[PDB]
Every structure is written in C-alpha cells, then in structure tokens.
Design an enzyme around this catalytic site. Sequence first.
Site, PDB file in Angstrom:
ATOM      1  N   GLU A  26       0.829  -1.208   0.000  1.00 24.87           N
ATOM      2  CA  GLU A  26       0.000   0.000   0.000  1.00 24.87           C
ATOM      3  C   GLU A  26       0.865   1.261   0.000  1.00 24.87           C
ATOM      4  OE1 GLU A  26      -2.819  -0.661   3.091  1.00 24.87           O
ATOM      5  OE2 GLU A  26      -4.467  -0.401   1.645  1.00 24.87           O
ATOM      6  N   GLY A  27       1.358   1.654  -1.172  1.00 30.33           N
ATOM      7  CA  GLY A  27       2.204   2.849  -1.289  1.00 30.33           C
ATOM      8  C   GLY A  27       1.430   4.148  -1.509  1.00 30.33           C
ATOM      9  N   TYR A  29      -1.827   6.159  -2.353  1.00 30.90           N
ATOM     10  CA  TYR A  29      -3.052   6.074  -3.154  1.00 30.90           C
ATOM     11  C   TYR A  29      -3.128   4.765  -3.945  1.00 30.90           C
ATOM     12  CZ  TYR A  29       0.006   7.985  -6.975  1.00 30.90           C
ATOM     13  OH  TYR A  29       1.010   8.207  -7.886  1.00 30.90           O
ATOM     14  N   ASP A 142      14.340   7.787  -9.827  1.00 24.12           N
ATOM     15  CA  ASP A 142      14.018   7.278  -8.501  1.00 24.12           C
ATOM     16  C   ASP A 142      14.423   5.843  -8.376  1.00 24.12           C
ATOM     17  OD1 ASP A 142      12.963   7.931  -5.862  1.00 24.12           O
ATOM     18  OD2 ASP A 142      11.179   6.747  -6.343  1.00 24.12           O
TER      19      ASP A 142
END
Length: 336
Positions: A26-27, A29, A142
């Site tokens: 669950e990162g 949204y 990233d």
Amino acid sequence: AAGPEMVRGQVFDVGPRYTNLSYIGEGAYGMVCSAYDNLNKVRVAIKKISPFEHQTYCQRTLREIKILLRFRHENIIGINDIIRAPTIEQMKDVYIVQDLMETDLYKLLKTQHLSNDHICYFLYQILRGLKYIHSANVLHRDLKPSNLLLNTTCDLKICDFGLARVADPTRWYRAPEIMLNSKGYTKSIDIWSVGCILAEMLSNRPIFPGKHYLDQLNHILGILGSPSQEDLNCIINLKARNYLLSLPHKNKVPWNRLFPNADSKALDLLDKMLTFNPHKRIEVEQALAHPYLEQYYDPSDEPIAEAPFKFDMELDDLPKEKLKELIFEETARFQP
Ligand SMILES: */C1=C/C(=O)[C@@H](O)[C@@H](O)C[C@H]2O[C@@H]2c2cc(OC)cc(O)c2C(=O)O[C@@H](C)C1
C-alpha cells in the site's frame, strides 16, 4: 462469486478476468495485490491507483503509463493490461496489471548476503535496463532497491516510472547535484542512484542514509570528502557553492575501508558511479563494459530504444481534468 472483490476495506474491482485477490502492499493512493489472470492463466500483480484529485498524482500516473506502454525490455516491468470504467465520469480508479514478481531488492537486502556473483548479476541487470531507458532519452529519477523487483530465478526488473522524465541535459539515492544546483537533469543522476544501490548490495546497508535534508549532503561528503576546486565549479548555483565552502574540510574515506571484503573491481566501478561531479560520472555504456561486469557484458544482447522520446506534453501545468482526459485516452488501448 459474490460481487466486486474487497481487499482490506478497499474496493478492488478487477472484473471476472482477475480473481483470487491477496494483498501485497500500500504505497499511498496505490494498493498492490496479487491475482490470477483467468485469460492468460498466469498470476499477476495489480496496482490500484486513485490519482484523479491531485495534479501531481495524475502526472505520475500519465507519465508511468505512457512510458511503460512504449517500453519493451526484459529488465523493465511491463504493463499487461489497465482496467478502468468505460466513461471518464465513472473513471475514479485505475488498475495497472503487471507480471507478478517474487520479491524486491530492498526486501532481499534485509535478509540475505549477496554473493559477488549475485551483486554482479543484479548490477548487470540494473545497468542493462538503464541502458535501454537512457537510449529512450528517459531519466528514471528514482532508482532505489524497492524499485528493483526480483523473481525466483534472479531476473531483475526495474519498476515505478512515476517520477520519470525526458532528459533535459527516497532522499538516500539522490545525486548531490539535485540538492545543489538545478532540479537534476542529467542521466548521471540515475548512475549515482545505481552506485548507491551497488554500495548497498556490498554491505546490506544504505551508504548515505541522511536523517534530514542537509544531512544527506554531509553523508555524501563524509565519504567522498570535500569537493575539489574543479568540482566546486560545477556547482553553479550561488547559494549552494557558498554553502559548500562554509563546510569544514572532509577527508575522502577509501572504498576498501568501508567495504573491506568487496571485489576491488566492484569498488573501482563504485568509485566511478559515486562521483560528485556529474560530468566525471561513469555513463551507462561504459559502466556495462567495466571489468567488474566482464562475465555478463554482451553488447549484442543489450537492446536500445528504437527511437528516443521527446515529450509531447512536458512542462505540464495541465489541470487534473485535462490529465485525467489523457489518462483516459492512453488507457483506451485496453478497452473492449
Ligand atoms: C513496482 C513499483 C513499486 O511500487 C515498488 O515500490 C514496489 O516495491 C512495490 C511492491 O509491491 C510491488 C510488488 C511486490 C511483489 O512481491 C514482493 C511482487 C510484485 O510483482 C510487485 C509489483 O509488481 O509491483 C509493481 C505493481 C510496482
């Protein structure tokens, strides 16, 4: 069977095609589940995203989808399918389906020593996907161990292109030039990140774990030492340059004192990746041809993009309703 499946209170409406839902992550949204693709008879990962109320979240969603629909490479997670409502009005959520991988580099580094062959093989694969991304004229921006997905056979795929951009040439994996001058617009930013990942594989332990914003720069100079005069000249922002000079002298800690047990070739590569000046930083093609990756390096087996991007929307400033619209159009490839 019942209705729309439910995972931890959140609706996971992935039609009959995908069943047998089981929570993974669950990162923010975006919740990630595994599932069974009843069409392809495989098990998949499915990411649910609800970006539509935040311009930033829409830009990341559009960017990731646009890029990843166009990429085809073994070391980059692809998009199998995107699920969404037939009307933009009813499109509140977007589900991205991708290959189920088995673990990620971050997870793997908190439980296992990597043999030198593995570090070497993972490095190789990171660099191979990177070569393809950079040939497409794209910056990932990233790279970090949690974005490196692994299967049981050690196949590595690069994930999460939500921060990606067409090259205009966590805080722990950020190139110092991003802290210093502009918003960091060279491919060397990604190479830096890979150096950080290399160092992390060598010791199971982040190399520059800054606890706050300016601390990150202190961790970097703690190791590389004070920037040289020529290196200072690449910091062309007034406030950063002066800040650098206001810092007390710092010695370069040799690589074999931080990593007494590493392959000296790996450390030579590490040096060239973790180079302060971005212009002196090793590029991806040279990184692959380094002696350290001798056993995997195979330039006939390292595809490049057929054509580089040059973004047909960059510098956005687009309102959400407009981004949503393009997201609706770009996700249409997948509609009945
Ligand atoms: C890949 C980018 C991410 O969101 C990463 O931050 C990643 O660490 C999230 C992680 O949930 C995925 C994940 C996890 C497993 O099991 C460990 C297997 C997967 O295949 C995936 C995955 O495919 O992540 C994709 C959806 C996002």
